[PDB]
């Protein structure tokens, strides 16, 4: 009866949407490439600055050029959206497009070394962050469940990879100074913690050949694992940039492996979109709308937001200090020992430290 | 340059969306009213069935008439929505409209008493849930930040009120039987804890005059609180329906108070809609997109689905059983004592029992 008409419209709308999957997939792929080159540029700039202008100048120069190439292709890929993007998507594109022109200024300062590594790192990260924020919004305008599923798996991956890039940066800073402040250490830990939800989401949503590829091509790194423990537990070697470089090179190799997988996710998504363009109701509705999947996308985007917010960072640190007190009081731990205990529980349960701390505070009646 | 170009198109699109506000606001109001009448019918049918066809026949008949009256208005409010409906909104609407025609069959069984109170309760609840699921979807085509914020606050409130209604039904069943099984008790507890995030979300998002009205009009009930404690602790009195009625009536007054506030929210939303028709980027962005607000709507829908799913219910019970074992082993608690401890922590911390359970399993290396 009336029901048939609501399905007829839903189906009409979805068939129209079919024709935008190509432009949408291409934009996502183009955002991925730009972000990747920006990640390369951020890395080279970091070493350039931490080395006092001794190293990686060539890489900075090649990086910037490759970024400029991808910028062109990104602006090209935005064209289809000019007369089709929703209000919310337009806002996301606007914020991303707003920061891009700052590259000129930023590069000059990196070149002249009139900026600190943490600052330049922060500015590259912000540009990247707003570019990535386009993706989930892109997904809100995609009705096909298979493709929306692939978009969220891809975004999850891209977001984990970005947090891996921030791990590289923060760790390089610490090893270059020869010390990790408690602040820097916490940020490093937060960048490592944060990857977990991202790649977990990716594994839950990806296709079997994709996760197979991930497990094979992106194996855990012993050296990175050891270096993480060093940064979190003791003074690094005073080898004047040598350990920083070992860290940087190992992380760079990991990031290149991740990129190899990411490129395949984008190929698979484009091919899948091509295929589609070749033509109980409640149970069916969840499979069609994928509400929990799209929520996951929003949660990762939100997690990203919080890591870039000082308000949020200090809020979470408040909880962690509280949880440390509980361990200090009821368990006779020392401050550093309390922090390490929470950190260890976070690793073992695959949760962030603030999640462990909140958990401890909710059941504190038992202490 | 290009920047202003994107902002210009956004503003322009938003301006155009102002024209859908009246029908979106109206549809939300008609959904609210239909859900309310269905809640009245659910409760009447429940007393009719639990009293073995002795009480509430008049209320059932009247309630059904009111529902039919609102269905007409609901179906009318759908006509304008058609022209602006996204694919996902179409699906939500189709789902809700798919179950509506089943009311006739359900009522006949209710009259003939050829259905159990829990079964009749569940079928009303299912129609209600799909109607409610339309509301958050309404936001996928609402660009205005203030309105979208109002829609989520309303949905949060509507959802808390629905769960309060399920609390009434579950408690009445238990008191009518003279016993709460461990099962019925968990479902009751779950309906009560579920209300917390709904009304917390409403309070965070509503306007000060709206939270004010709520704080004054919908104050906690000592009688309901005492009866909750009875249902969760000891055996209820075998007074052949007397306590059940006491429960039902207290809860029904509570729901009418909530309804008063809900009607205000709708009036306010409509006024705001009319007044709109007649009118540091990370900062501007958040204010405009309201990611936290969309997150809240997500979570409440998630909670809603979980309470409706046996898979989800049993997944969560597994966690609660594990947490109980932890208390039984490392703290020497009896099983019932263990369960009571978890429920207690959940009230005190304003979290669901499964969240308390998860918290304890997360840190149990500390007890080890």
UniProtKB/Swiss-Prot annotation, chain A:
Superkingdom to which the source organism belongs: Bacteria
Residue ranges occupied by any ANTAR domain in the UniProt entry: 300-361
Organism taxonomic ancestry: Bacteria, Pseudomonadati, Pseudomonadota, Gammaproteobacteria, Enterobacterales
Sorted UniProt keywords: RNA-binding, Transcription, Transcription antitermination, Transcription regulation
Domain NIT: 29-276
Cited InterPro entries: ANTAR (IPR005561), CheY-like_superfamily (IPR011006), Nitrate/nitrite_sensing (IPR013587), Nitrate/nitrite_sensing_bac (IPR010910), WH-like_DNA-bd_sf (IPR036388)
Claim: Transcription regulation is one of the keywords in the record: yes
Pfam families given in the database record: ANTAR, NIT
Presence of keyword Secreted: no
GO terms for MF: RNA binding
Protein name listed in UniProt: Nitrate regulatory protein
Function: Nitrate- and nitrite-responsive positive regulator for nasFEDCBA operon expression. NasR protein binds to the factor-independent terminator site located in the nasF operon leader RNA to effect transcription antitermination.
Species, as recorded: Klebsiella oxytoca
Gene Ontology terms: biological process: transcription antitermination
Gene: nasR
UniProtKB/Swiss-Prot annotation, chain B:
Gene Ontology terms, MF aspect: RNA binding
Record SUPFAM superfamilies: CheY-like
UniProt domain NIT: residue ranges: 29-276
InterPro entries for the chain: ANTAR, CheY-like_superfamily, Nitrate/nitrite_sensing, Nitrate/nitrite_sensing_bac, WH-like_DNA-bd_sf
Gene Ontology BP terms: transcription antitermination
Domain ANTAR: 300-361
Keyword RNA-binding set for record: yes
Pfam families: ANTAR, NIT
Signal peptide stretch: none
Domain of life (superkingdom): Bacteria
Keyword annotations from UniProtKB, A to Z: RNA-binding, Transcription, Transcription antitermination, Transcription regulation
Stated role: Nitrate- and nitrite-responsive positive regulator for nasFEDCBA operon expression. NasR protein binds to the factor-independent terminator site located in the nasF operon leader RNA to effect transcription antitermination.
Protein name: Nitrate regulatory protein
Species for this entry: Klebsiella oxytoca
Recorded name of the encoding gene: nasR
């Amino acid at each position: 009866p009336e029901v048939v008409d609501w399905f007829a419209r839903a189906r009409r709308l979805q068939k129209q949407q079919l024709h935008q999957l190509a432009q949408q997939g291409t934009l996502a792929g183009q955002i991925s490439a730009l972000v990747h080159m920006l990640q390369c540029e951020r890395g080279a700039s970091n070493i350039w600055l931490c080395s006092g202008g001794r190293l990686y100048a060539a890489e900075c120069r090649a990086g910037a050029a490759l970024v400029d190439e991808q910028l062109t292709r990104f602006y090209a890929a935005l064209e289809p959206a000019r007369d089709a993007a929703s209000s919310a998507l337009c806002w996301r594109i606007a914020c991303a497009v707003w920061y891009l022109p700052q590259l000129a200024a930023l590069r000059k300062r990196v070149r002249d070394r009139e900026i600190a590594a943490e600052e330049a790192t922060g500015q590259f990260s912000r540009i990247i962050r707003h570019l990535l924020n386009i993706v989930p919004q892109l997904n809100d305008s995609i009705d096909d469940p298979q493709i929306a599923g692939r978009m969220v798996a891809l975004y999850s991956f891209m977001q984990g990879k970005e947090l891996a890039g921030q791990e590289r940066a923060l760790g390089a800073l610490g090893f270059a100074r020869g010390q990790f402040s408690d602040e820097l250490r916490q940020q490093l830990v937060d960048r490592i913690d944060g990857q977990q939800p991202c790649f977990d989401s990716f594994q839950a949503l990806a296709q079997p050949p994709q996760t197979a590829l991930f497990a094979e091509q992106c194996q855990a790194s012993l050296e990175i694992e050891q270096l993480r423990r060093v940064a979190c537990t003791r003074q690094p070697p005073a080898d004047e940039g040598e350990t920083a470089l070992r860290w940087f090179c190992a992380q760079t190799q990991r990031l290149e492996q991740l990129r190899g997988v990411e490129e395949l996710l984008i190929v698979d998504l484009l091919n899948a979109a091509d295929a589609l363009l070749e033509g109980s109701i409640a149970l069916r509705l969840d499979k069609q709308l994928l509400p929990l999947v799209r929520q996951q996308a929003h949660e990762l985007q939100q997690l990203s937001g919080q890591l870039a917010s000082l308000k949020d960072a200090l809020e979470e640190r408040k909880l962690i200090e509280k949880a440390k007190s509980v361990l200090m009081t009821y368990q006779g731990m020392q401050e550093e020992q309390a922090w390490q205990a929470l950190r260890k529980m976070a690793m073992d349960k695959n949760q962030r430290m603030v999640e462990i701390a909140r958990a401890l505070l909710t059941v504190k009646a038992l202490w």
